[PDB]
């Protein structure tokens, strides 16, 4: 058969990933422009939301050195790929868990609906890639929203998860943090309530 050049193989991002990708977290000075956890300036159209979460290992212990990258549509269901800190909204962001509490946060807007390649609408979602010490190749997941029950039920991606019980692992819980709309999305890498991870 036809063999292409092989892809460069992945390796763990390691416990000191913050040196390269989360400078403040490492304890170091930042550069003039950093790619970080605020996807929306206050003037961005859409519903402004806080996202937060904790990451657990197979023993139910916090993964305190996790690093997350996120990719999401703007409120109108459009992916904005021209990354610029001058923009009111960027579709891409980065965050990391705090070493003491194990909590990450993101500041964004709720994404609009995007169609799959067959033209079927997907429920509102944020694409997440998870990196850490002990993770050899990053884990892909999606964060969906518990207040989108009717869309979630019809999502062609959620519907590829064979067991309905597993679909629940991808649904973030609406709450209020300091009077602001928030959603909690915890990830369990392994064992009871293991988060669905994707290959594509």
């Amino acid at each position: 058969p036809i063999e292409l050049l092989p892809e460069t193989p992945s390796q763990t991002a390691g416990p000191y990933v913050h040196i390269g990708l989360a400078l403040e977290a490492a304890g170091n000075p930042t550069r003039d422009q950093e790619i970080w956890n605020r996807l929306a300036k206050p003037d961005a159209p859409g519903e402004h939301i806080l996202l937060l979460g904790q990451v657990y290992d197979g023993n139910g212990h916090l993964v305190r050195d996790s690093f997350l990258e996120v990719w999401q549509a703007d409120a109108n269901g459009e992916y904005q790929d021209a990354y610029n800190l001058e923009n009111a909204f960027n579709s891409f962001g980065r965050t990391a868990t705090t070493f003491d509490a194990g909590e990450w946060t993101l500041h964004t807007v709720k994404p609009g609906v995007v169609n799959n390649a067959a033209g079927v609408p997907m429920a509102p979602h944020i694409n997440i890639s998870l990196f850490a010490r002990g993770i050899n190749i990053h884990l892909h997941t999606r964060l969906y929203f518990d207040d989108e029950a009717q869309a979630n039920a019809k999502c062609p991606v959620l519907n590829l998860i064979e067991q309905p019980q597993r679909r629940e692992t991808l649904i973030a819980k609406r709450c209020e943090v300091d009077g602001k709309t928030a959603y909690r999305f915890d990830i369990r890498i392994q064992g009871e309530g293991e988060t669905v991870f994707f290959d594509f």
Binding site: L4, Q11, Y16, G20, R31, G134, I189
Partner: protein
């Protein structure tokens, strides 16, 4: 805004390291036990950030000068350079390449590194750049030293530099580690050996590149990166 107009060759997850590689101890509890769920590519997966308009400082790619506290860092002056291509051999221009590392003594500038080898007051350990229009990148740095770590009772990482590459979509984004030609620690490392296929390990070993060295100044290493092949859609929805 971004458009869905390409597909990316499926990953070989036996070429990449598997999730569960127990000699690398921290992988035991941080590996999923359920199978990954395969999904078809949509605009969500086949698009990604372009960083053409991120503002880079003058020395962002130069670790000999980007943590200047009154002098040069101590250690082996090297250029690390190479090309980013996809599996079809196409260059990947204007893509974000980030790298980080310990200093000459294997000490990381991170609050959580307690290794007893000293920090270097003129070495930070982070670089970033974009590949040029032909897919080439280059950094200037100090060769990092091997680093002991609490895996087995006498485990030592080979000299290594972490790399993060965005590529054209979130489907192509990769983090990996670069190792150095001839390092006798490479065959011994349980993180290197998370990769089962010895030919895949060879793809992470940077080669000494005398042709790119600056005489009386700095050596050079070459590290080429291959991202997932990108092709147009064909015969879809019909």
């Amino acid at each position: 805004p971004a458009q869905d107009n390409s597909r990316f060759v499926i990953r070989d997850r036996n070429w990449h390291p598997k999730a569960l590689t127990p000699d690398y101890k921290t992988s035991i509890a941080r590996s999923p036990r359920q199978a990954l769920v395969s999904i078809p590519q949509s605009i969500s997966e086949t698009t990604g950030p372009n960083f053409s308009h991120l503002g880079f400082g003058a020395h962002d790619h130069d670790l000999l000068l980007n943590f200047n506290n009154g002098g040069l860092p101590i250690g082996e002056r090297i250029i690390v350079a190479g090309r980013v291509v996809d599996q079809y051999g196409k260059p990947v221009p204007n893509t974000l390449v980030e790298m980080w590392q310990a200093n000459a003594g294997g000490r990381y500038r991170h609050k959580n590194d307690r290794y007893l080898a000293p920090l270097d007051p003129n070495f930070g350990g982070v670089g970033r750049c974009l590949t040029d229009s032909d897919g080439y990148y280059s950094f200037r740095t100090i060769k990092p030293g091997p680093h002991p770590w609490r895996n087995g009772p006498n485990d030592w990482r080979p000299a290594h530099i972490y790399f993060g590459i965005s590529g054209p979509s979130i489907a192509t984004k990769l983090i990996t580690q670069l190792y150095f030609e001839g390092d006798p620690l490479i065959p011994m490392c349980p993180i290197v050996k998370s990769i089962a296929n010895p030919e895949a390990v060879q793809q992470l070993i940077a080669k000494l590149d005398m042709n790119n060295a600056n005489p009386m100044d700095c050596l050079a290493y070459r590290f080429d990166i291959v991202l997932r092949g990108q092709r147009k859609t064909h015969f879809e929805n019909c």
